[PDB]
Design a protein around this nucleic acid. Sequence first.
RNA 1: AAGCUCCAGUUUUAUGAGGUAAAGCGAAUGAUUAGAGGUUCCGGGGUUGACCUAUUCUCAAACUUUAAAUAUGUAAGAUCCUUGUUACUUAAUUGAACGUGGACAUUGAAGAGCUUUUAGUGGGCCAUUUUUGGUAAGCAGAACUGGCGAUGCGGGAUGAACCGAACGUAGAGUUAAGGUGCCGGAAUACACGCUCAUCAGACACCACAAAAGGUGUUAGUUCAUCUAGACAGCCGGACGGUGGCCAUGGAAGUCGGAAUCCGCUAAGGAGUGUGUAACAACUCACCGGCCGAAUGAACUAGCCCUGAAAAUGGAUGGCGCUCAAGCGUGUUACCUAUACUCUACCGUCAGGGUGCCCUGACGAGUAGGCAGG
RNA 2: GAGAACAGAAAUCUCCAGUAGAACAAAAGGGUAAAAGCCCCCUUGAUUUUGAUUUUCAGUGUGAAUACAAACCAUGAAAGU
RNA 3: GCAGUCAAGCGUUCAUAGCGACAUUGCUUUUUGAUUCUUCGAUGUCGGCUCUUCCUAUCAUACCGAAGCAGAAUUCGGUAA
Lengths: 49, 181, 160, 167
Amino acid sequence: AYQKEYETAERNIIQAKRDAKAAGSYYVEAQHKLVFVVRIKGINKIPPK
Amino acid sequence: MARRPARCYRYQKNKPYPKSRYNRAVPDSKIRIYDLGKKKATVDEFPLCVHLVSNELEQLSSEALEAARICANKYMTTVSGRDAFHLRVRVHPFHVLRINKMLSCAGADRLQQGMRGAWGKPHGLAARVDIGQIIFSVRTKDSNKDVVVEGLRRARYKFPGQQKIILSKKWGFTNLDRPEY
Amino acid sequence: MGKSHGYRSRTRYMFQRDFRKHGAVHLSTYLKVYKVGDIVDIKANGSIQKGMPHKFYQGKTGVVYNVTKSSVGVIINKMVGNRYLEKRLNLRVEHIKHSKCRQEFLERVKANAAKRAEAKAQGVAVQLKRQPAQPRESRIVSTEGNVPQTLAPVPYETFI
Amino acid sequence: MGAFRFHQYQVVGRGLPTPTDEHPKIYRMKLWATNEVRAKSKFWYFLRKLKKVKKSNGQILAINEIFEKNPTTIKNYGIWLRYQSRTGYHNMYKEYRDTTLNGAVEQMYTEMASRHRVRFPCIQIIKTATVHFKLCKRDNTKQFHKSDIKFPLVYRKVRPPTRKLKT
RNA sequence: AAGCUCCAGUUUUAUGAGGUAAAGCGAAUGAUUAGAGGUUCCGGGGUUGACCUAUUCUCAAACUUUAAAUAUGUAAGAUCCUUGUUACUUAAUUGAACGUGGACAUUGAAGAGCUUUUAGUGGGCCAUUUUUGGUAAGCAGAACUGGCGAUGCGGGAUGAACCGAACGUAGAGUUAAGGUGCCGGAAUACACGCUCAUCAGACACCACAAAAGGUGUUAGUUCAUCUAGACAGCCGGACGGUGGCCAUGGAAGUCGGAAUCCGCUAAGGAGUGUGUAACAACUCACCGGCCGAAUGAACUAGCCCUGAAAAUGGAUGGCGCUCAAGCGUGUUACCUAUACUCUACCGUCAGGGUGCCCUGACGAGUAGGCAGG
RNA sequence: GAGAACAGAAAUCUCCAGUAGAACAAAAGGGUAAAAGCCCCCUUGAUUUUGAUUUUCAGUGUGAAUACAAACCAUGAAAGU
RNA sequence: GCAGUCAAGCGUUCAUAGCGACAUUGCUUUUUGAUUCUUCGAUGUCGGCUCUUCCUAUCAUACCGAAGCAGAAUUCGGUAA
């Protein structure tokens, strides 16, 4: 649903962006997202810290 | 002089040390002069300026500095004659070297005690020359470009830190430097 | 062994003041009196000569426990060891400076605290925090028993 | 294509920042990458290189990716390149024959790697710039390919299995 | 251990502080130095004006303070009101702030408080980071931390402290680190590129290899020259203003020291080197042809060799392959620990429940304490 | 720096310009301008008693210091010190 | 101890037949120091004799390069144990 407002607004957005540098003006999306954390790496060779 | 290669000196030893209270009777600066050639001349006559710049982080010996700079000077003053162009040494020699000086055999080892023991007795001066630092900045005219370049080549085999010859830009070039009057 | 241990050593950066702070201090600072429970930094001014703490104590924050004549009594905590005790320091007002951070902290919580009261009457912002604070608590409040509870972790078992 | 080579991800964004009448202005770097893992990274490295920012000050608005627009076929990519070897990074413009942007990456990597010194830590590049077939200048592999489009020359080049048959 | 009793941390806010680079103060090697006021001496000439010191604006880097440090670890620090009554230091004077008595209203999770008694020291070590001494050292001596000691097992040829990993038992599965030509699980894997020395099968390591680095090795870059014809070689041409001022025994193309125009014009420079005391030729410049397609100079990095010499016998662990079994770039699939998950179950502790049964978590161990046998 | 015969060591005295580069018995470094420096007077509190606490040392003494209150005086306008 | 680079310079003239400073990078482990790893319930010392095996940085012999090699004594240097 977030993505729809950008899509609706902009024809312009895509073509310019693949071909060259610069960015266009008018809108922008903020985002939240919660996280999950898994510990890959062990205790060996680290501070207690 | 007295041998030690520069295996002893070249890597970056010591919390400096060359502080003026803490060392009466250092052995001398042996560098004959820092600016050379036309000392009575501004930078601005010369359209060419050539530099010599380090690849490594070192302490260069005072003797190596004079030996490299005199070797360059004999090439300049023989080919361009006595009243040539103009050279400046970038780096003066003021880092002070300690080394312990040749014991004895008395079974007197170090007679000290066992020892050694700070307050080591000074062996002379070196210069810090860190990565990308410029040892010589030379001002010349393009019909003697070649002469300064071979003088800079004959300089390199007389210090151990690996260095590169380069053409300068600074502020400007030499002619965006000149339009305001 | 060798050399000293010593109060004055290692002071050169701490003792010394900026080009701007240099010159005689202003007697207003000397004049200032404080109340118990005020929060004060201790860091000695170089430009006062006497009243100075051990040098090692500077940059710590303490609470004015009591005063006895011109100098004031500050509680601060040091660090390291076993069953470390909190210390009283006699440290002058010239060397003691206010702390803004709690003052603005106090105003904000209190300014907030008025906004809430009206909300408690007619409004529901919260709700969960409301449930402990009516059921909760006297102490009276404001007591010296809470201080050893804080005192006890300062000697840290792990660090040791 | 199959299992990438580096589709360029057109990453866009902002900044997005503070209570001041400022704000950073609108940017692009279109960076060659494998997807979003790479996407993030490059942006922070670009933000280090040119810009300055932060991580937090750089805000990513959107992502749009890369397949084949134009032909598989036959740019001979002009690449602006930097290789890190026995000190830091030295400038390069390398114009080499390729199929495509997927390929370009591999052919350059193989060239930094082998020829130039390259190892891990690197990064990448600055730009890739298309060119007309006849224009292509430096030179070995491509000179033959330019000639091939020509043709006749495709009738040339036609060589590789050649010694094998009998006919 | 044995018991007693029922709080810990962290971003964020605020403080002040390591530091070390370019200014300021102080020191200052220590140049170069123009401009420019003034020292003080004599010494010559027609107030001026040669002669040495030396302010003053003014210029290459070092070092100890300090800004602003930039940093980064840090690094301490996170109830209110009213009423009465009492005190208080300080003009028979002004105030607060004390203490009471009474009422009113307010991202974390056992990491945890206290006591008695007990033991082994009270000789350490290595690595990482930051060092300090020392030429250095499998050195000395600090800091901050992990490991070894006291820690197995898997990797690394072996191998206290390197990587993975913290271990009750037993099994099945799947993995780490790291590896897949054979030894040797598991690929003679897939896309490509370089290398031909047997380089080379190597994180760290008693793993060596430098300055110098050639270099026409390969590659890359930067600047110039090319179909208007470069380039290797071979071939080939040159009249005239006029043998040019200064100086000197003497420069006259070519010892030193000037300007630099022009004829005509394939083209024919007041000249590239070879000369004699000096003059005294011949070539080249500049120009043309025979050929036809790229070209050379500067830097850089791989590779590589060159630098490259040692003692009882050859190795990268070994055999020893070289569009790889090298090395680098990407990439697919496999293999592989006591790990992790799970099954069963032994101790502790949560606890529950009826001398006994059950749930789930944690669970290597020297010195050593305690408790059961 | 200038100014004053003689005097160079030349105080000396004078005028200007002069913010911590001076002075402050003694290392070091820090620190301060009607100052804690310099001067003039007056004086004895370099008194006795007790010492909260820190440094000692995180709990361990002497010693040291920073603060008192009692006792006593000084100078000082007095506060105070 | 020996080597490499650079080559100031000397060699009548000529860097390099030969000699070669300053500087500078290495290598070896066979002098000397440094250390404190190993051994203080014990490693027999120097030196010499004699018997063996080795090394290459080669003094001679073999083959070669250069020369300031006329011969020729020679000098320097390569390969080589």
